[PDB]
């Protein structure tokens, strides 16, 4: 097997070559270098998967070197490969190759072609490091790498300061999440003496026989890092603003790499979470609340990209709900399918934007179904997959598996939250589609078209052996759950057709009402989370920075110089040049000396 | 028997640079380059032949090389030099930064450049002497001998856009801070020597013989306080940090004197060698105050660095926050935290040296330093904004660079010692990311805010690009493979830590 190092090295070689070219090469040469590096990484990933399935799906380890070794602190530079890591590596490499080919078509005639491709190659290398990490610290290396590449790619069009503000907001919120992850790292190393995943799982139950508070804090801090990276409650405020960059960048972040890192963190450290059931229940509750809030927020938005942002937020909330009900296989299957159809949707929206001009509102355009037929078909298939259309779309099977896992573990509230979320997902998805589309066969689009259907549902990740098996529901409950999901989906589809396709009198009357306007302006700003975070963190930080901008400690240490200068000016008054005063001062000093000598004795 | 040459090659080279100016105006730069190359190669020879990787901890004293020669036998004072892993790492670091400071002052061919190189090599020899001196009087002598060339380099060869009186004020403030701190250190040294003499009856200023000196709690606390005040000025530690941004801003615009004298941190090494072993009980009693001062220094330096409208003051406050991290690492009792402190010192030196070199290049290209007045410079230059982005990434604490390694072993060991201070320091890491992004935004991204920013600027030369890329390669290799540095410092750090823990 042993070509994981090639899957990391080749995107790194592409990144170095395209950074050091700094635009001197042609667009064709830089395009083939970047796309070829990613495609060769994908081909080596395919050979790795062939070799993995040739054997008995055994976990493989390639220890490259040892990173740091100070006493008991032995952090190694090793790569591990199991079914979960193979699934993530295949997803990242394939979807990244599709996005790279689309962006090779899409970035033609733009500034920073080689810079864009170097940044995306570094992004792919960082995510491959994240998913192949043997220990927690190499996963932290990949964590910071994908955060840095997210910052460097959101603010790709750097000349607009709004792009820079969005990129640094994303970087700061993610860095708070990575500080929570670092807290998890510190607690886990202080308790167990190691950060290797298998070693942590092995030595966790023996060490916490008496007290489970430190393991609870470690799993809670891991949850905080995961919701920081995956844009969940309460660190979700950056994902909506994260579309200041290009749409291939948004496709990569929302489908291939970035938002799926928290799901990988929770699934990989599932052994630690199983010993703390309350933290896993908190993961499920956080995912349910996040998907509900994202579904409510995406219903009122007037942009294609921001609607797709809150759609990604709701899908990640579905994954976190699946992880909270211990439906790990359902979560990873949903990760595969959601990566497929969200990459498809984002590339279709990029083609919609490029075919149009000036990046307009969704309310201005209508009847675009005849203008671009193939992009309409791509958007229809992506919407049907996102709305979980039964028996044709992979999203139906993924959400069905998530809901079956929720039922089989006795989670009724999470089940009904998922049902309401699917209803709202269908609602906002065809609301946007019926608003923008009513009223040249590129191969990545065709591949994402095929993978968003049931053909993508035919692929099963090899999770049998890595993650625990989900408990199986009864056949009648499973059948009636599929029936309920199907009728909820089609009721949402027909309601979205009834409201936004037509004269739109009822929706405009609802929006024009004062409670309707209040709800629209509440859900437009992500329930007031951005405003609260501004007024709680950003404004006092700026106030303290303005208050301290003239160094107060420097003045509090420079006042001895002021006292010395004032004392010198005061003492120089005695040197007036008057001889009678000099004689008087000598007699005064004689009196003082004599009085002191008589007093002291 | 090689360390006196490590100190005397810079001094003889500075004298030769002053004397060889009459042969030609562009001669003394070559002489300074040759002498600092000889010093760096000889430091690397000591690294190669020292066998530091196979050396285990044996207890203080344990020196890989040593040299003794009587200097003032009335007081028992000798020129006594000793090298082990920690001092050798610092000596290699100052040799490399000396070569970079010579190469950075290239293409400044003016009158009395030979004197500029003379004060440069005298500063670097004083830094080497501070690292190698293992007796109190010679350590203090090198501690205060570096400051006169620093003062004259700031005051006479400083920022040519300054008023001429602001350079005088900054240099005088820096000198007064450092010399008053040194005098307090000399009082502590003299009282320690007198306590030793009253206890035993011999006169000595030697660190090996001054160890295990019996003294009461109050006396030991006062001696610790004097040493810590001296090391707190030069780290810097708040509120004694006021000299550093003014000295950095009013320094010579090349940036060479920054890397030679102000950027290198002898105070953390001084704390490690002369404060924890000499007064371990007093340091254990003072650890809460010093660690909270480090926390306040991190957050204060972050808030200052965000609010600065100048690049050099911004980088100075980055140095303040990073040495707050190091000061938190010092007063723990963990070997892991100390090893992270060593890595953090070296990596912060490399990263902020690259930052200061790039700021000097930016100023020599666009003739201003105001971040509110320039902007959008990515499209106007060839190499500088990308390398500045890399070095801001390094100072941000990013893996693949040595800063991440350093401060994360610092935080790991500190959490093993004290959890709350580690928590607050990680939020300081968030703040460091904040000011790095702010500097990158205000400097290179957006629309150009003046006409000089809206103009095409010549690219960096082969020399500046090659030395910046050397710094980049060293930072990346330190980030990904820090094992040779940890293996070199392991014996000395284990000696210091094992002395600190069982004597309290
Ligand atoms: C490791 C696997 C991934 C895991 C996560 C890792 C995270 C940390 C990685 C840090 C690497 C640096 C990232 C931030 C800096 C990016 C620099 C950049 O933007 O480079 C692109 C730029 C070309 O941009 P362009 O617009 O075309 O031109 C500029 C003006 N004409 O390029 C240039 O202008 C020239 C190049 C500038 C510097 C590029 C980066 C240098 C450092 C890395 C390579 C070092 C050399 C290789 C050998 C290392 C030691 C063996
Ligand atoms: C995070 C990404 C994944 C890692 C790859 C890239 C990392 C960054 C590359 C630049 C820095 C590299 C620094 C480390 C180099 C290798 C270190 C080494 O030689 O380790 C010794 C090891 C021998 O094995 P062993 O006896 O077990 O040694 C134990 C070590 N403590 O030696 C070995 O086992 C050698 C195995 C082969 C190593 C090949 C490395 C090629 C790297 C090409 C990178 C190109 C791009 C550079 C810039 C990257 C971005 C910053
Ligand atoms: C309430 C309970 C739940 C809490 C959850 C955890 C916290 C989540 C915080 C998320 C929100 C962070 C928002 C950051 C925005 C950064 C981008 C931004 O606004 O940039 C603007 C400004 C740019 O700087 P400048 O170059 O001057 O720009 C010129 C004009 N703008 O740059 C700035 O103004 C700088 C902004 C700096 C913001 C610092 C934030 C620190 C966060 C600390 C989190 C602590 C959490 C734990 C709290 C205690 C719990 C016991
Ligand atoms: C230059 C060489 C190009 C080789 C391309 C190889 C890949 C084909 C195109 C992308 C297909 C992506 C399919 C992803 C499937 C993921 C399956 C995961 C199973 C666990």
Can you put this structure into words, describing what you see?
The PDB classes it as proton transport. This is part of a larger assembly, with chains A (601 residues) and B (504 residues). With 601 residues, chain A is mainly alpha-helical. Chain A folds into two domains: 1-524, no CATH class; 525-600, Single alpha-helices involved in coiled-coils or other helix-helix interfaces (Up-down Bundle). Chain A has helices spanning 4-21, 27-54, 83-106, 113-131, 136-154, 161-192, 197-207, 213-229, 247-256, 261-268, 270-274, 277-298, 304-324, 328-355, 373-386, 394-408, 412-436, 443-451, 454-457, 475-500, 505-512, 514-523, 529-547, 552-571, 579-600; strands at residues 60-70, 73-81. With 504 residues, chain B is mainly α. Chain B has one domain (1-504). Chain B is 70% helix and 3% strand. Chain B has a two-stranded antiparallel ribbon with strand order 1-2. In chain B, helix 1 (3-19) runs antiparallel to helix 4 (113-132), helix 13 runs antiparallel to helix 14 and helix 17 packs antiparallel against helix 18 (419-444). Chain B is globular. Chains A and B meet through strand 1, helix 5, helix 6, helix 23 and helix 24 of A and helix 13, helix 15, helix 17, helix 18 and helix 20 of B. The complex binds 1,2-Distearoyl-sn-glycerophosphoethanolamine (3 copies) and eicosane (LFA).
